[model samples]
Target: AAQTNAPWGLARISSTSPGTSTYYYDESAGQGSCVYVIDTGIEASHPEFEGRAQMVKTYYYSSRDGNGHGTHCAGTVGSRTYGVAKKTQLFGVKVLDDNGSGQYSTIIAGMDFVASDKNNRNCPKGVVASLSLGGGYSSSVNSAAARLQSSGVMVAVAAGNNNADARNYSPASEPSVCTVGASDRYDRRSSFSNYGSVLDIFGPGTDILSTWIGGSTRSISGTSMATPHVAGLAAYLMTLGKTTAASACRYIADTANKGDLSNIPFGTVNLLAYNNYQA
Candidate 1:
């Protein structure tokens, strides 16, 4: 493995130890997979996406992201510059409104759209979905996400940002999807990130720089920022023959760098997201 020099977050996952200060990844990473970004939306023309990004569907808003949240998550998931998969195709599946605060029905509808694409010609090698939004428990919302996962799409979702147990949230608490938590550059869980047994893994979230709405980049935090990193890795891994959502998730966790994140809360899993890259 050589080096894929980049910002702090990218460098951290490519090596086993923290503070590598450089990143390295397989050039073939994510080449055969695509990810559905279920959020505000995405800046499809963002240069960092390298022409691999597109706005495929929407629920209650335009395909364009008013807030940069969708674009940022897309960048971290598969942007040529800031993403984990690096080469995965990006699909912006808008669910939230431009002003934010969307109803759970919209969320369910967004997932329905992704599930409909399971047999589409575009997603042949397996698919991944990144959801950086969550709130109160809703059986309908959980069912939608679970349905998408059952459709063979690897679904990765935020473990909430309330600093409380993820068990308090819907999709996060739902066992079918990969619930992600946030970790900072120092391997400590983010101070505001939700925790507990529901978390599938942790990923860099604090001060992360990724593609923004205006074709630029921004640094932000939250478990919202961390879920896409896992989605990106899942996309990349799916190309390696883990075509099913469950198998892909199990592989990611089994291959994860164990005991890397410090100060684990009582039921939170200590696995940190890793791309299995070495140098």
Candidate 2:
């Protein structure tokens, strides 16, 4: 699920990133799958995307990202250079604003849009929702995510960047979703990443370089970056014919790089992500 000579983040997960064969790339590179990036917005014109991304909706301002957070996350999720699944169809669901602030209620609205078919824009079958925003726990948002999961949409959310327990956050603490924590290049927890039983897995998030606004690029860090890595992996799995959210989650957990986090508690620590699989 990577293009030729892709960057480090994808290289660690998929052999195709550096010109080799692997289980995920053996069948597909996220072809025929779709992912919704529920964040600020995306710079859809970025050349690295090869014109596959679009801004589907926005809750506050126009569906344009001036802050670059959404675009950066999008790059990691599906861009040709930095992506995990290079061929997945990507859509931007703008719930946060240019200041990188948004309300929990607004995020629920964005989720509703993805779940609704009334507008003919309902998320496609086996779609993955990548959310990097969070706040205090909100039942409404959690319920929305559960409902979507029941309807076969996989949700991957950030486990927050507060360096505290993730159970204190909203959707990150929610059930029926893949809650992702940030891991550095060393495969250890990023100092800023949240942890706890609520987290489901870890991904490379430190100094993550990706596409930015205005056709530029930048490197940033957060659980935000880690979440999309899982999301893109989810998209790749979907293309391999895993049809439900729960099954996809189970497959990922079963095959992950287990017992890699020495510092994390044995029982509570989720597995480190492993996309470099070969059968």
Candidate 3:
């Protein structure tokens, strides 16, 4: 059940440069890694997820994914068709509400939950979390993210869609989390993507297609869409023995395509994420 032809966004990360229409990844990509998607929740019943996705906790009224954002992000992380880590196990941590917005308190609650998961699951590879939602600066939220990463979980956060300085954002601004920005197919920074020295890396985010609610699919854009690619890549690295959060993040930065992106301002890191796959 491996993928052959790939989504353009997926194809963009495998090779050193863009324009290739294929994606190459390990046959057992993210086989033992756990990717916790802390967002609006995920539709475990979606066909793209099949048996791979489930909810471990919820800060909302219920665990259902009323909004499509979480399912979309989860798909980009490890769906059988659109994922970067095609076989990773997914855990849904519902922090956002149906409108794709959540309180910072609930968000930290979700992060605290993920921190407790460290070493408790006994996962062979390791634990990684995707936080594709962010708001203005919050000291409480920042500390929660820092604690989660120190708990040995790889934390990937969205650099925000405000098109302003990412240094002004909350969890994304936190130094301990891997803050991701968005780029287009041409390796250009997306117009709405937040930037600055605070960003950790960039990934394919413009017009990204992935699993949606109602057992369907949809195309969306945002740094929200891009953060999961890093989470998925972190999951992949975990399978390769980069199991610790610190080591996985180091490998990701070290292996990223250097200075490959265009239109990046002076403060942002010029690296675009790469899975080190050669097709």
Least accurate stretch of 10 residues (summed lDDT) in model 2? 15-24
Q: Per-residue lDDT of 1-279 in model 2, one digit per residue for the tens?
A: 224544556665653222232224544667777888999899999998899899889987498997999999999998877888888888998999999999888988888887663235543446888999898778888887777667667888998998888888888889788888887766678889998888888877887889999998998999999999889898887777654566776677777777765457544565777764565
With a 3 Å backbone cut-off (N, CA, C), the pairs that clash in candidate 1 are: 4-23
Q: Best lDDT goes to which candidate? A: 3
lDDT per residue (tens digit) for residues 88-115 in model 1: 8888888888875688988998898888
Candidate 3 lDDT by residue in tens digits, 134-242? 9999889999999999888899999999999988999999998899999998999998999999998999999999999999999899999999998999998788775
Query: Please, what is the TM-score per model?
Result: 0.95, 0.90, 0.96
Off by over 4 Å in 3: 118-120
Task: Score candidate 1 by lDDT.
Answer: 0.85
Model 1 bad stretches (over 4 Å): 1-4
- State each candidate's clash count: 1, 0, 0
Would you list the C-alpha lDDT of every candidate in the order shown? Answer: 0.85, 0.79, 0.89
